[PDB]
Write a protein that binds this ligand. Sequence first.
Ligand SMILES: [Mg+2]
Ligand SMILES: [Mg+2]
Ligand SMILES: [Mg+2]
Ligand SMILES: [Mg+2]
Ligand SMILES: [Mg+2]
Ligand SMILES: [Mg+2]
Ligand SMILES: [Mg+2]
Ligand SMILES: [Mg+2]
Ligand SMILES: [Mg+2]
Ligand SMILES: [Mg+2]
Ligand SMILES: [Mg+2]
Ligand SMILES: [Mg+2]
Ligand SMILES: [Mg+2]
Ligand SMILES: [Mg+2]
Ligand SMILES: [Mg+2]
Ligand SMILES: [Mg+2]
Ligand SMILES: [Mg+2]
Ligand SMILES: [Mg+2]
Ligand SMILES: [Mg+2]
Ligand SMILES: [Mg+2]
Ligand SMILES: [Mg+2]
Ligand SMILES: [Mg+2]
Ligand SMILES: [Mg+2]
Ligand SMILES: [Mg+2]
Ligand SMILES: [Mg+2]
Ligand SMILES: [Mg+2]
Ligand SMILES: [Mg+2]
Ligand SMILES: [Mg+2]
Ligand SMILES: [Mg+2]
Ligand SMILES: [Mg+2]
Ligand SMILES: [Mg+2]
Ligand SMILES: [Mg+2]
Ligand SMILES: [Mg+2]
Ligand SMILES: [Mg+2]
Ligand SMILES: [Mg+2]
Ligand SMILES: [Mg+2]
Ligand SMILES: [Mg+2]
Ligand SMILES: [Mg+2]
Ligand SMILES: [Mg+2]
Ligand SMILES: [Mg+2]
Ligand SMILES: [Mg+2]
Ligand SMILES: [Mg+2]
Ligand SMILES: [Mg+2]
Ligand SMILES: [Mg+2]
Ligand SMILES: [Mg+2]
Ligand SMILES: [Mg+2]
Ligand SMILES: [Mg+2]
Ligand SMILES: [Mg+2]
Ligand SMILES: [Mg+2]
Ligand SMILES: [Mg+2]
Ligand SMILES: [Mg+2]
Ligand SMILES: [Mg+2]
Ligand SMILES: [Mg+2]
Ligand SMILES: [Mg+2]
Ligand SMILES: [Mg+2]
Ligand SMILES: [Mg+2]
Ligand SMILES: [Mg+2]
Ligand SMILES: [Mg+2]
Ligand SMILES: [Mg+2]
Ligand SMILES: [Mg+2]
Ligand SMILES: [Mg+2]
Ligand SMILES: [Mg+2]
Ligand SMILES: [Mg+2]
Ligand SMILES: [Mg+2]
Ligand SMILES: [Mg+2]
Ligand SMILES: [Mg+2]
Ligand SMILES: [Mg+2]
Ligand SMILES: [Mg+2]
Ligand SMILES: [Mg+2]
Ligand SMILES: [Mg+2]
Ligand SMILES: [Mg+2]
Ligand SMILES: [Mg+2]
Ligand SMILES: [Mg+2]
Ligand SMILES: [Mg+2]
Ligand SMILES: [Mg+2]
Ligand SMILES: [Mg+2]
Ligand SMILES: [Mg+2]
Ligand SMILES: [Mg+2]
Ligand SMILES: [Mg+2]
Ligand SMILES: [Mg+2]
Ligand SMILES: [Mg+2]
Ligand SMILES: [Mg+2]
Ligand SMILES: [Mg+2]
Ligand SMILES: [Mg+2]
Ligand SMILES: [Mg+2]
Ligand SMILES: [Mg+2]
Lengths: 44, 76, 63, 97
Amino acid sequence: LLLECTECKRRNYATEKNKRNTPNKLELRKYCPWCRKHTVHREV
Amino acid sequence: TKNGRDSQAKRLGVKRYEGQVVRAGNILVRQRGTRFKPGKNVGMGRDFTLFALVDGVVEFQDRGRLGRYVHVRPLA
Amino acid sequence: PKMKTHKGAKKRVKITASGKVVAMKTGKRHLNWQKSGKEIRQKGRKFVLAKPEAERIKLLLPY
Amino acid sequence: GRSTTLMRLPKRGMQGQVPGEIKRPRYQGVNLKDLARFEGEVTPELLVRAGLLKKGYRLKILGEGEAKPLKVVAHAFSKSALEKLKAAGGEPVLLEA
RNA sequence: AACCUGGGGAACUGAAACAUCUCAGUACCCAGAGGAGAGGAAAGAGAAAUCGACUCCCUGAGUAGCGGCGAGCGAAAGGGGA
RNA sequence: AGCCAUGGGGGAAUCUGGGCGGACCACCGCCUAAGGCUAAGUACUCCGGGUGACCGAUAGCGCACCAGUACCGUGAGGGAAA
RNA sequence: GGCGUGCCUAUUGAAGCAUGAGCCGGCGACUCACGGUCGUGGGCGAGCUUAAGCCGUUGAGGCGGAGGCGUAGGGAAACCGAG
RNA sequence: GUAAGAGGAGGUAUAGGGAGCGACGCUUGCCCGGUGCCGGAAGGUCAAGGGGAGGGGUGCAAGCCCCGAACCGAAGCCCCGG
RNA sequence: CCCCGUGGAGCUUUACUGCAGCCUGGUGUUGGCUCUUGGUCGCGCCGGCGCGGCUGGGGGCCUAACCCUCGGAUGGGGGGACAGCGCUUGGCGGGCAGUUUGACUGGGGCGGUCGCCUCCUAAAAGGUAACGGAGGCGCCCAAAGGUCCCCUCAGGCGGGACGGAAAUCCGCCGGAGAGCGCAAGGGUAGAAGGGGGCCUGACUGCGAGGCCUGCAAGCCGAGCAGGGGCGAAAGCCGGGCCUAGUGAACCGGUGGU
Ligand SMILES: [Mg+2]
Ligand SMILES: [Mg+2]
Ligand SMILES: [Mg+2]
Ligand SMILES: [Mg+2]
Ligand SMILES: [Mg+2]
Ligand SMILES: [Mg+2]
Ligand SMILES: [Mg+2]
Ligand SMILES: [Mg+2]
Ligand SMILES: [Mg+2]
Ligand SMILES: [Mg+2]
Ligand SMILES: [Mg+2]
Ligand SMILES: [Mg+2]
Ligand SMILES: [Mg+2]
Ligand SMILES: [Mg+2]
Ligand SMILES: [Mg+2]
Ligand SMILES: [Mg+2]
Ligand SMILES: [Mg+2]
Ligand SMILES: [Mg+2]
Ligand SMILES: [Mg+2]
Ligand SMILES: [Mg+2]
Ligand SMILES: [Mg+2]
Ligand SMILES: [Mg+2]
Ligand SMILES: [Mg+2]
Ligand SMILES: [Mg+2]
Ligand SMILES: [Mg+2]
Ligand SMILES: [Mg+2]
Ligand SMILES: [Mg+2]
Ligand SMILES: [Mg+2]
Ligand SMILES: [Mg+2]
Ligand SMILES: [Mg+2]
Ligand SMILES: [Mg+2]
Ligand SMILES: [Mg+2]
Ligand SMILES: [Mg+2]
Ligand SMILES: [Mg+2]
Ligand SMILES: [Mg+2]
Ligand SMILES: [Mg+2]
Ligand SMILES: [Mg+2]
Ligand SMILES: [Mg+2]
Ligand SMILES: [Mg+2]
Ligand SMILES: [Mg+2]
Ligand SMILES: [Mg+2]
Ligand SMILES: [Mg+2]
Ligand SMILES: [Mg+2]
Ligand SMILES: [Mg+2]
Ligand SMILES: [Mg+2]
Ligand SMILES: [Mg+2]
Ligand SMILES: [Mg+2]
Ligand SMILES: [Mg+2]
Ligand SMILES: [Mg+2]
Ligand SMILES: [Mg+2]
Ligand SMILES: [Mg+2]
Ligand SMILES: [Mg+2]
Ligand SMILES: [Mg+2]
Ligand SMILES: [Mg+2]
Ligand SMILES: [Mg+2]
Ligand SMILES: [Mg+2]
Ligand SMILES: [Mg+2]
Ligand SMILES: [Mg+2]
Ligand SMILES: [Mg+2]
Ligand SMILES: [Mg+2]
Ligand SMILES: [Mg+2]
Ligand SMILES: [Mg+2]
Ligand SMILES: [Mg+2]
Ligand SMILES: [Mg+2]
Ligand SMILES: [Mg+2]
Ligand SMILES: [Mg+2]
Ligand SMILES: [Mg+2]
Ligand SMILES: [Mg+2]
Ligand SMILES: [Mg+2]
Ligand SMILES: [Mg+2]
Ligand SMILES: [Mg+2]
Ligand SMILES: [Mg+2]
Ligand SMILES: [Mg+2]
Ligand SMILES: [Mg+2]
Ligand SMILES: [Mg+2]
Ligand SMILES: [Mg+2]
Ligand SMILES: [Mg+2]
Ligand SMILES: [Mg+2]
Ligand SMILES: [Mg+2]
Ligand SMILES: [Mg+2]
Ligand SMILES: [Mg+2]
Ligand SMILES: [Mg+2]
Ligand SMILES: [Mg+2]
Ligand SMILES: [Mg+2]
Ligand SMILES: [Mg+2]
Ligand SMILES: [Mg+2]
């Protein structure tokens, strides 16, 4: 499935793949942006 | 029929042999599993590729029980 | 009478001051999805051609 | 005989636009190593008047070689070449109006 | 005879099929003009507070661009001339 | 996707007028549409002449000769030999 | 007396029962223009070169720098520059 | 036939066009789900156009300019029956 | 005849795309009066009555455009703002036009196949063909991933309330015949397998050097920097034991500097 992560209060995406009906409605895994470094990532 | 199908050749094997100079990174051996093992100055990667970790000559160790290893004996 | 430059190539290939022919790497516009950071990072840059490189130059002409 | 080796791909962002080329002041790089070639007051008029300019609307002196102490008018200089000569003579800059 | 201008206007062919595109506003048909014909004294150029009708040659330039951005097509201003 | 042109529909103003400067707007600037004429530079070669590292009768024009003939086709038209 | 399977073409292979040709004479097929790219003979050299055209000549050349190639690259670009 | 027009026909449903069968005798069965045709003032979708909530670009503004929801909009198709 | 050529042409259709034709909405040609439903602005009057321009729709009537016709008519009669024609909208449209309608192939057709992975064929490097012999792929996982820690199978025999051919349990033998998501293979417990605790490196910026290779592509990869994760730490992490799980370029979608 097409899942494109997004940075909070900013603008930066990421390579992903959510799963269909499988237990996964919202994802909140960490990462590492360009501007500054390390910030929580919500789905959307 | 229902046959005549196949997957392209994967060209794997010992790439450097015992007593060849090699630079760092040189793929030493490409392999189906751990038909060989790393060892001295010799790393290995996702596929099981073994590769020099410093320039130097290669050598092959048999160790029975423990399996076969490959190393670079460095020098400069 | 005066060969015309091949615009298609102009539009996608530079001929370097020494004489090389540079292009953008293929494979980085939608096969894309999950491909290692490495994968698509590596696709980011230009490369150098070979025998077609000579074919290439033949078009880019008054160019 | 097949799908050509234009498998490669236009990067040349800004290929065109209907009315196309946008007139805009272009600068001709001339080194102050080919400047040493003489003595006086080097100016756009001169470098083109004979040698290494050629109607390229704008003179920009720069780069390699050693700067002969003298006036050298131009439309722009190199951070590096400004030095070279500023450390031995006059750097007078382009027009304005 | 050919040259010219206006009205009309193909296809083979190229694209290694083909339909857009190309061939080509060509071949040809028609009307008219004439020793030529057209064009012609800016409701212009296009970036310089610049040029100064029109036509022709050189150049600009295979550039700017156009293009199933394929095959291909392909200017102008400016500069040198008549 | 402006500019020029215009088949259909709506439809102004006369210099506080209009048009253009590549959607559009503001600025700046350019030009004055909806009447007409204008030589030269240019194109061509039936015609006359001059010249050829152009032909020399299977060549050169189809024709050096009584050839657009003889002959062939209802015809458009084809078209020699010498 | 010894020896000896036409010519061309086309073919894995032709004397070939494969193609073409009665014979002779004459006609008969890799050109030129522009632009590319190598090589080569030469002129000049960080330069080199003129196009139309004008003047000359009437198998004489010269003028003509507009312009082109080169002297800086890198970037999509702004830009920066021996980087 | 682009048109003007002509043929139909200087005819008028006992006529004219199309289609199939093919003197004459006896006859011609069932299946409208699909296709065609015919019918169906409802409904559904449906283009230009009308409409203009709402949003935009620009200007100091008056404005200029663009995008655009509901809603109205034929035939056709859907649907309903023969 | 037969095949072949990305040759031709005639024919067909619910092949593709047009074109004629035909149907159609708006609009120009295009006018008058009247009745009634909806809108519209001002006023009189407590969402409704009266009025005019504007109307949009629908009904009716008119005549003078336009059309037909009448012993030639600046007219009479019939039709009538319709039709016809112009522009434009969408439809139906082999009547017609241009074309398309793959390759392999012990001839072609029919059948089958077409990319990727595994094994054999393959002759002990690599690579090898056949309409040779056999099987898979077009996914799956946020726990099936990172790291720290911990434990080790299948099976055979003996024993156990249901159940014993095989649940779960104790014992003894048991080096791997299990497991490792899925095919096959190579690898593997001195873990890559089972269980836990914390976690998201299924990172950004790169990339010495190689494998492989006609090209394009594919593959491996130390290390540098940035900022992180688990660990006391040495260290390990740029997804998953590995090898399939895919698609140049154009054109376009969304979000950003
Ligand atoms: Mg095979
Ligand atoms: Mg690693
Ligand atoms: Mg791994
Ligand atoms: Mg890893
Ligand atoms: Mg060179
Ligand atoms: Mg990047
Ligand atoms: Mg050039
Ligand atoms: Mg192909
Ligand atoms: Mg002509
Ligand atoms: Mg073709
Ligand atoms: Mg072809
Ligand atoms: Mg061809
Ligand atoms: Mg014409
Ligand atoms: Mg005349
Ligand atoms: Mg004259
Ligand atoms: Mg004249
Ligand atoms: Mg005239
Ligand atoms: Mg005037
Ligand atoms: Mg004019
Ligand atoms: Mg002046
Ligand atoms: Mg294409
Ligand atoms: Mg053209
Ligand atoms: Mg002259
Ligand atoms: Mg002249
Ligand atoms: Mg404008
Ligand atoms: Mg008009
Ligand atoms: Mg402008
Ligand atoms: Mg203004
Ligand atoms: Mg003459
Ligand atoms: Mg003559
Ligand atoms: Mg003759
Ligand atoms: Mg003779
Ligand atoms: Mg003659
Ligand atoms: Mg006769
Ligand atoms: Mg014989
Ligand atoms: Mg023979
Ligand atoms: Mg033959
Ligand atoms: Mg012969
Ligand atoms: Mg014979
Ligand atoms: Mg040449
Ligand atoms: Mg009649
Ligand atoms: Mg009639
Ligand atoms: Mg009649
Ligand atoms: Mg009759
Ligand atoms: Mg009967
Ligand atoms: Mg029956
Ligand atoms: Mg009802
Ligand atoms: Mg609003
Ligand atoms: Mg505003
Ligand atoms: Mg404002
Ligand atoms: Mg307002
Ligand atoms: Mg409404
Ligand atoms: Mg309808
Ligand atoms: Mg309807
Ligand atoms: Mg072919
Ligand atoms: Mg064909
Ligand atoms: Mg009313
Ligand atoms: Mg009405
Ligand atoms: Mg009415
Ligand atoms: Mg009436
Ligand atoms: Mg009447
Ligand atoms: Mg009446
Ligand atoms: Mg009258
Ligand atoms: Mg009536
Ligand atoms: Mg064709
Ligand atoms: Mg075939
Ligand atoms: Mg067969
Ligand atoms: Mg088949
Ligand atoms: Mg093998
Ligand atoms: Mg082998
Ligand atoms: Mg190899
Ligand atoms: Mg081989
Ligand atoms: Mg679990
Ligand atoms: Mg699990
Ligand atoms: Mg038991
Ligand atoms: Mg864990
Ligand atoms: Mg490398
Ligand atoms: Mg590499
Ligand atoms: Mg690393
Ligand atoms: Mg670090
Ligand atoms: Mg830190
Ligand atoms: Mg590791
Ligand atoms: Mg694991
Ligand atoms: Mg394409
Ligand atoms: Mg496209
Ligand atoms: Mg899209």
